Amino acid sequence: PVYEHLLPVNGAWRQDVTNWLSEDVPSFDFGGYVVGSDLKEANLYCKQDGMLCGVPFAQEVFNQCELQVEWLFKEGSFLEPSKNDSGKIVVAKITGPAKNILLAERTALNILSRSSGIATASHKIISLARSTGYKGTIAGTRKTTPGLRRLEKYSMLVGGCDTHRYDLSSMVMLKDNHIWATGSITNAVKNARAVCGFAVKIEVECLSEDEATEAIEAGADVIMLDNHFLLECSGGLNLLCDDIDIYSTSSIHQGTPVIDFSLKLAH
Amino acid sequence: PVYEHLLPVNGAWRQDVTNWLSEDVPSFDFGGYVVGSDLKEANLYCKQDGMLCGVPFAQEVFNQCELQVEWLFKEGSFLEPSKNDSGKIVVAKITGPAKNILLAERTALNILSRSSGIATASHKIISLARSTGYKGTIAGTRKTTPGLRRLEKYSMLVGGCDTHRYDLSSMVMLKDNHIWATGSITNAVKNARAVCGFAVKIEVECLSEDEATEAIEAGADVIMLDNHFLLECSGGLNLLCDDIDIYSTSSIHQGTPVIDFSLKLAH
Amino acid sequence: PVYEHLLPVNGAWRQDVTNWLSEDVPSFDFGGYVVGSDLKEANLYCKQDGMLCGVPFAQEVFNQCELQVEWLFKEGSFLEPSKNDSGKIVVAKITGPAKNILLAERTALNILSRSSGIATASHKIISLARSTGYKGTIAGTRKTTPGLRRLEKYSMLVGGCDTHRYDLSSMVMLKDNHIWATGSITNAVKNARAVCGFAVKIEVECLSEDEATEAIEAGADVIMLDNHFLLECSGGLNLLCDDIDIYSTSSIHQGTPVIDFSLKLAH
Amino acid sequence: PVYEHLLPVNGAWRQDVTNWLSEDVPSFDFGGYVVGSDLKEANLYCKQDGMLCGVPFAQEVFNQCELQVEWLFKEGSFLEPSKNDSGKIVVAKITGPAKNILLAERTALNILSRSSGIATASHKIISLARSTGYKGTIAGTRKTTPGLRRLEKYSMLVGGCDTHRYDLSSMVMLKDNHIWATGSITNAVKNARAVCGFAVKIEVECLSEDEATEAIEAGADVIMLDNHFLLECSGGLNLLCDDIDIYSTSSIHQGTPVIDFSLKLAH
Amino acid sequence: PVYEHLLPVNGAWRQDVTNWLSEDVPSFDFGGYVVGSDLKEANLYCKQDGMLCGVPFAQEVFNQCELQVEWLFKEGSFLEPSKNDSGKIVVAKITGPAKNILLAERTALNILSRSSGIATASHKIISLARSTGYKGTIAGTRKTTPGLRRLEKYSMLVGGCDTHRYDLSSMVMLKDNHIWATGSITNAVKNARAVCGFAVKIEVECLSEDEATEAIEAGADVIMLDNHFLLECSGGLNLLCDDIDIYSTSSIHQGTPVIDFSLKLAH
Amino acid sequence: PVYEHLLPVNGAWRQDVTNWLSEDVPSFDFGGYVVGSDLKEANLYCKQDGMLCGVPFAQEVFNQCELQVEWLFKEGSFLEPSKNDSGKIVVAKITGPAKNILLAERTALNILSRSSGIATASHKIISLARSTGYKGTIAGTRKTTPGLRRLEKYSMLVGGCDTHRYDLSSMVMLKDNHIWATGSITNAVKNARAVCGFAVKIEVECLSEDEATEAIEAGADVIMLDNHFLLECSGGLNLLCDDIDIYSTSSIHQGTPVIDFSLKLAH
Ligand SMILES: O=C(O)c1ccccc1C(=O)O
Ligand SMILES: O=C(O)c1ccccc1C(=O)O
Ligand SMILES: O=C(O)c1ccccc1C(=O)O
Ligand SMILES: O=C(O)c1ccccc1C(=O)O
Ligand SMILES: O=C(O)c1ccccc1C(=O)O
Ligand SMILES: O=C(O)c1ccccc1C(=O)O
């Protein structure tokens, strides 16, 4: 199975790429005027160790900029530029009008660097959490970059982690606020179940068995314990995991370092 | 002078907020349905030391969700949640319908956490270079998060750094590419000048004082070097600061850690 | 609990209303020009028996046209315009500039008529199956009107039916296609699970208890048949209701009759 | 002449198709991930008697999903699946990546089923109204589905009826409200004529000859009688038509039943 | 009757204003940052003789920038900044935050200057033809500024001219092309009528009374000639006005001079 | 260097063209229905003396309308139709479906006529201002047509003039308002420099040397004198230029006459 097949042949994600280009060229591209449209060739280099992610998104940038791209690595490949190659590894070869290449450059790399960065941070964490014997799952959160949720969630998947619920319409998540308001957790879950129906899971954030009792009771599919159903623990920082089904943490995607890339024309 | 005044009373940045809300509620807000619309109070907490930023953007989120907000610190205030008596500082008091607070919560926090992160990274870096006699200035780059350029460049400013050119339409930045293409740094600058006009500057990435001077006479406004005019050094990070007018780095905005925030109802 | 609370205070659904107004006034509103802006009163009448629905959507239309509205019945009220003394029931009192009322009129009525239609069809069908001992539940499908999914699924809910998965991102629904492709119901479910994660369910359309069980063990959350887990029957309409957890049909929302409404000024 | 030539080679109607796809895939298409991109072949079946409509719109769905379509029937063709063929008739053959076919499926059928449904209801009515000897015209209304006016009006045309005015900017339509406000029908029409000019027709809703007098008087092009100019009668229910030029009725498009379709991959 | 009532309370024209503000502030408004938000007063001056137009559009700009405006003249007032005591007439008093006034200034002026220009050119031309016994009417064309059709056609109306058909969907206008294609003016009109229906007119560009009459009998509503029905002459400009129902010219709206305006703070 | 290379291979300017087409065809294109899709050929004529401008924009109209265009003149070419050729000169040959040609016609010409019109007015002015011995620069303003700034600024460049700052985010421009508010011009420029940074120029509108003193003082890059730095004079009307670096005037783009064009199918 190929991860890039998660993206619909057409949809709003492609218009996003268009909007990212417009963000970079509000009026005219002066540099492209001087460099002209002569056919050039360029190398796209990875300059740091990590997992390659965000290929389909970057590919869409190149398509709209009408360039031809030859990827030398599949998405998900671990790159090690430090051994040494002048510090870099070419992961793609670009061909097309000079101005088009230089126009597509910044946006494409800004995509790859962050996407690869999240996959690398994602993989590092689950790998590290799984090396302790913990066979549960490591998940993200909804603490994504505004307007970039599609790409960031996608990067979590390639990094090997669970994306968790995508948004507020995906899985009901009731925490203390919701419960106080409906009153009973069995009522909170009752109402939640009334609208979300059977096709969506309901998770409840509990403190004591009491809550996690009526919660399991009412029919909640997931119980979060904070401090025929699943258990979750939100926080995951360091050193330990203990047979809980899910440990959620924004560390795999929010505020993670980026994986540097560069693009240089042949001559 | 107030930074938020940099943002136009109306414009695309506000629709951005709207699209960020849509990103999180593609269809229904089940949690909002259970929680209902009773008036509530909530505290917005800063959970980590750093410079507060993203206030007007978080405020626009609160406005669209029809809430009332009381900010306790001006934007740019160096927060220090050190007192551990809680390790948090209430940065704002929020009031409104229960479902509205919970709907605005994630989106607003994702804004504040990242904006404050960048403001912080930008401030600790410009001061870090300030504590070495360097009296020039630190600048950003175009390596910003796709679709979030306006917010990130805004953070850099509050952070104390120079944002540098905003996009591919805000300066001309010519490299070897544009010089090889035009024939000479003078031909490239002549061309760039032919389109950008007197109102916009032109920067040339010279790699020799020999050419740098023909660039300086070609009409350039800024001269760059890297591994009647300004001078810049572009690249990496440590130790090294000659008296160059500007030093740019994506370190003040790209791949920076975020500043933890949270929101809790009074109950 | 109030259904309209399912809709976010702000989001794409409100721009939808705006685009619906544009659809009706591409350029000028001549009738509005003749009628002017004198304050007027109007009665919104229900002309046929059925469950009232589409109130928050009609209300958003009235808000954008800057009108004041007084609703006489809660959403979901079974209206019966039988008294013929008029055969109509005033469902709302509207006041505002004459041109504003007439501009909002068609759009708001088209909303109410269709939303009430679906709520009605959905209610008479779920009860129709309820009066045969069946205590499971009736669900909708993805066979919704293009661009009107949010409104139609909303109607189903008020109507008393389960809306079923919202889109191609809200459950995984695997068929022979996905099984042939992956090799086994278990391979398909393993793959679906690899991307949707723990937060979202997976339904497999088994056509044999032999496989249905490998689907049930593969990790499925729902098992479908058609001409620790739930069970569904998908298809047609009459007479027949075994104790299957769910029965889906596009009959509750697609091709349903509408519920006649009208609006008249006081004069 | 070909009906599909009414749609501009490019325009907002194509972006609508894109928006309908996004409505179905807010985030990821999990099913498409498992089924992969293997080239498949599929049959598009009509499962109910009626007129085939909405071809260009469905074709646009397939283009954006990058599929190849072979239509075995021209738009407007009467299909009779009941005789018998296993109940179905293949009207199109689809070829393309498996995931693309399955992605395009739901939206394309949701289009065809409703479009064909309106054309069939439209044709049935005029045919039935014309079999009484009435040689006038049968027209629709503005009681269309919000956001789907282009397709629904189009379906009326293929069904053989008149679409009537497209929107509030097409033809002025003054009913009692408008007249009371300008005062005289000759004034109401006077003002209306002042802005709409000569390129657009003015229709007035009358009660007594008096109104339909000054109406014809002032220069109204169409007179609606409700209960060098044209006459209209809005309501048309059943059994009779009497030499009036136009009988308008929402029965040909609003709340009509749908014509079922299905799509199944070859193997 | 008030012209501004031609514009719907809400619709795409208001988003247009918003996009016009974005066009002018792609990122930040530095000038707004220096000037701050102190309440100020300003005078909007008309600097050249002509008919005032574009008031509701300028007002929408002032609304979005959260300002209060006091208009001194009704739209359509023939302004004459002749008194030279100043050569200007205060057309409106504006109050609000300093940055808001300065942000709204250019956009609002560009609106007023062009709208007033067209209203003026349209008025001096229709009267110019009026002072030659001609009692028919002057009309516009489709040769409008891209993206500004609504504003320009609006100006024509206030200017006193007929706007003519609004777009390619508001009349059918058939030429030799459509006749050659269909075979006869009658076949073309029959086809046009088959799709536009009774509600919309059909104009045929006849170049012979011989055909003009078959067009007139084919069902045409308007007959055009150029270098139970109306008659039009399309083309140029001078001296010549037979008793033809309509004379169209792009002179009343395309390539017209603008009417100078300015805005100044009280200080 | 080619001017059309200033436009990004993809960006919002292409969506604008799409929006201009939709503005012309809100619903159906009746004329295109009758004329059908037969392959035709057409000539695009220039009917007035002037400079050809707006080629890339017009080309984009033809691409979206799927036509093939053969340009017989490069953008910037001076056309002289008066000598005589029947008054016209073919500058492009169009080939494609009849309906597509007729659909693209109006929008393409509305573009060319205005663009060529601005370039011609632009060239005429600088040429005339440069024939006096003045070797400074002639610039435009921000008094552009709302929503058409990209094309109008572009036309100024081809006409030979300077576009001046593109928008409110391009170059800071402080006039009396701004100065009064910050107080000192050295403070006004100080604050301005605080946010705009080094990459953007600051221009100050002065009255007396005093202002133009502290202005040069604080570090203002351009001084406008109204009545290592540049001088500007805004107003330029007629007869004289005196060794100032820049004379700005909206005369080169606002309210300029248009250069007529026409398109006629071969037969
Ligand atoms: O963002 C959060 O608060 C969050 C935190 C942990 C897991 C899941 C979520 C979620 O909301 O989906
Ligand atoms: O984006 C970059 O690579 C960049 C890096 C350093 C300074 C400026 C820029 C810029 O292009 O604006
Ligand atoms: O859309 C369908 O064909 C469908 C039919 C019945 C249940 C669910 C669905 C669904 O796909 O969500
Ligand atoms: O929708 C209506 O009220 C209506 C009803 C009958 C004919 C035409 C119309 C119309 O408005 O165009
Ligand atoms: O656009 C034109 O060429 C035109 C010219 C004169 C009248 C009407 C029109 C029109 O097409 O609407
Ligand atoms: O539009 C103006 O006021 C203006 C006038 C002259 C030069 C420049 C400008 C500008 O704002 O950019």
PDB file of N, CA, C and O in Angstrom, chain F residues 135-153:
ATOM      1  N   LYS F 135      15.598  63.277 -17.583  1.00  0.00           N
ATOM      2  CA  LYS F 135      16.073  61.899 -17.601  1.00  0.00           C
ATOM      3  C   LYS F 135      15.696  61.147 -16.324  1.00  0.00           C
ATOM      4  O   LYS F 135      16.220  60.066 -16.048  1.00  0.00           O
ATOM      5  N   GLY F 136      14.785  61.729 -15.547  1.00  0.00           N
ATOM      6  CA  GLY F 136      14.343  61.089 -14.324  1.00  0.00           C
ATOM      7  C   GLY F 136      13.381  59.967 -14.657  1.00  0.00           C
ATOM      8  O   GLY F 136      13.379  59.457 -15.778  1.00  0.00           O
ATOM      9  N   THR F 137      12.548  59.582 -13.699  1.00  0.00           N
ATOM     10  CA  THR F 137      11.602  58.504 -13.939  1.00  0.00           C
ATOM     11  C   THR F 137      10.155  58.955 -13.787  1.00  0.00           C
ATOM     12  O   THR F 137       9.846  59.855 -13.001  1.00  0.00           O
ATOM     13  N   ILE F 138       9.273  58.336 -14.561  1.00  0.00           N
ATOM     14  CA  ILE F 138       7.852  58.634 -14.480  1.00  0.00           C
ATOM     15  C   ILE F 138       7.225  57.402 -13.829  1.00  0.00           C
ATOM     16  O   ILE F 138       7.444  56.273 -14.279  1.00  0.00           O
ATOM     17  N   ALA F 139       6.466  57.622 -12.760  1.00  0.00           N
ATOM     18  CA  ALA F 139       5.850  56.521 -12.034  1.00  0.00           C
ATOM     19  C   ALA F 139       4.338  56.636 -11.887  1.00  0.00           C
ATOM     20  O   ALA F 139       3.755  57.712 -12.040  1.00  0.00           O
ATOM     21  N   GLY F 140       3.714  55.505 -11.580  1.00  0.00           N
ATOM     22  CA  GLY F 140       2.277  55.477 -11.399  1.00  0.00           C
ATOM     23  C   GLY F 140       1.914  55.744  -9.952  1.00  0.00           C
ATOM     24  O   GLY F 140       2.637  56.444  -9.236  1.00  0.00           O
ATOM     25  N   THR F 141       0.795  55.175  -9.519  1.00  0.00           N
ATOM     26  CA  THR F 141       0.316  55.356  -8.152  1.00  0.00           C
ATOM     27  C   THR F 141      -0.413  54.087  -7.702  1.00  0.00           C
ATOM     28  O   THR F 141      -0.256  53.025  -8.308  1.00  0.00           O
ATOM     29  N   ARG F 142      -1.197  54.200  -6.633  1.00  0.00           N
ATOM     30  CA  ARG F 142      -1.978  53.071  -6.140  1.00  0.00           C
ATOM     31  C   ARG F 142      -3.434  53.335  -6.494  1.00  0.00           C
ATOM     32  O   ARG F 142      -4.345  52.703  -5.958  1.00  0.00           O
ATOM     33  N   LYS F 143      -3.648  54.286  -7.395  1.00  0.00           N
ATOM     34  CA  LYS F 143      -5.000  54.640  -7.807  1.00  0.00           C
ATOM     35  C   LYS F 143      -5.469  53.750  -8.952  1.00  0.00           C
ATOM     36  O   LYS F 143      -6.016  54.233  -9.951  1.00  0.00           O
ATOM     37  N   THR F 144      -5.251  52.447  -8.773  1.00  0.00           N
ATOM     38  CA  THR F 144      -5.618  51.420  -9.742  1.00  0.00           C
ATOM     39  C   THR F 144      -7.073  50.966  -9.626  1.00  0.00           C
ATOM     40  O   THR F 144      -7.770  51.279  -8.656  1.00  0.00           O
ATOM     41  N   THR F 145      -7.538  50.236 -10.636  1.00  0.00           N
ATOM     42  CA  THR F 145      -8.905  49.718 -10.634  1.00  0.00           C
ATOM     43  C   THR F 145      -8.981  48.589  -9.623  1.00  0.00           C
ATOM     44  O   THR F 145      -8.185  47.653  -9.671  1.00  0.00           O
ATOM     45  N   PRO F 146      -9.939  48.655  -8.688  1.00  0.00           N
ATOM     46  CA  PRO F 146     -10.040  47.580  -7.692  1.00  0.00           C
ATOM     47  C   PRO F 146     -10.100  46.192  -8.331  1.00  0.00           C
ATOM     48  O   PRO F 146     -10.851  45.968  -9.279  1.00  0.00           O
ATOM     49  N   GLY F 147      -9.298  45.268  -7.809  1.00  0.00           N
ATOM     50  CA  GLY F 147      -9.290  43.914  -8.326  1.00  0.00           C
ATOM     51  C   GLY F 147      -8.506  43.717  -9.608  1.00  0.00           C
ATOM     52  O   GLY F 147      -8.343  42.586 -10.066  1.00  0.00           O
ATOM     53  N   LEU F 148      -7.997  44.800 -10.188  1.00  0.00           N
ATOM     54  CA  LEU F 148      -7.250  44.682 -11.439  1.00  0.00           C
ATOM     55  C   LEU F 148      -5.843  45.256 -11.315  1.00  0.00           C
ATOM     56  O   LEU F 148      -5.205  45.572 -12.320  1.00  0.00           O
ATOM     57  N   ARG F 149      -5.353  45.391 -10.088  1.00  0.00           N
ATOM     58  CA  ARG F 149      -4.028  45.953  -9.881  1.00  0.00           C
ATOM     59  C   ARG F 149      -2.908  45.188 -10.574  1.00  0.00           C
ATOM     60  O   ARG F 149      -1.992  45.803 -11.127  1.00  0.00           O
ATOM     61  N   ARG F 150      -2.961  43.858 -10.555  1.00  0.00           N
ATOM     62  CA  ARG F 150      -1.896  43.087 -11.184  1.00  0.00           C
ATOM     63  C   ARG F 150      -1.710  43.444 -12.658  1.00  0.00           C
ATOM     64  O   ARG F 150      -0.587  43.698 -13.110  1.00  0.00           O
ATOM     65  N   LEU F 151      -2.813  43.482 -13.399  1.00  0.00           N
ATOM     66  CA  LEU F 151      -2.773  43.785 -14.827  1.00  0.00           C
ATOM     67  C   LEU F 151      -2.411  45.232 -15.146  1.00  0.00           C
ATOM     68  O   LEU F 151      -1.653  45.488 -16.090  1.00  0.00           O
ATOM     69  N   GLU F 152      -2.951  46.172 -14.367  1.00  0.00           N
ATOM     70  CA  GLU F 152      -2.691  47.592 -14.590  1.00  0.00           C
ATOM     71  C   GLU F 152      -1.249  47.983 -14.280  1.00  0.00           C
ATOM     72  O   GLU F 152      -0.655  48.785 -15.002  1.00  0.00           O
ATOM     73  N   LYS F 153      -0.682  47.423 -13.218  1.00  0.00           N
ATOM     74  CA  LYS F 153       0.708  47.706 -12.873  1.00  0.00           C
ATOM     75  C   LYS F 153       1.586  47.111 -13.963  1.00  0.00           C
ATOM     76  O   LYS F 153       2.567  47.713 -14.393  1.00  0.00           O
TER      77      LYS F 153
END
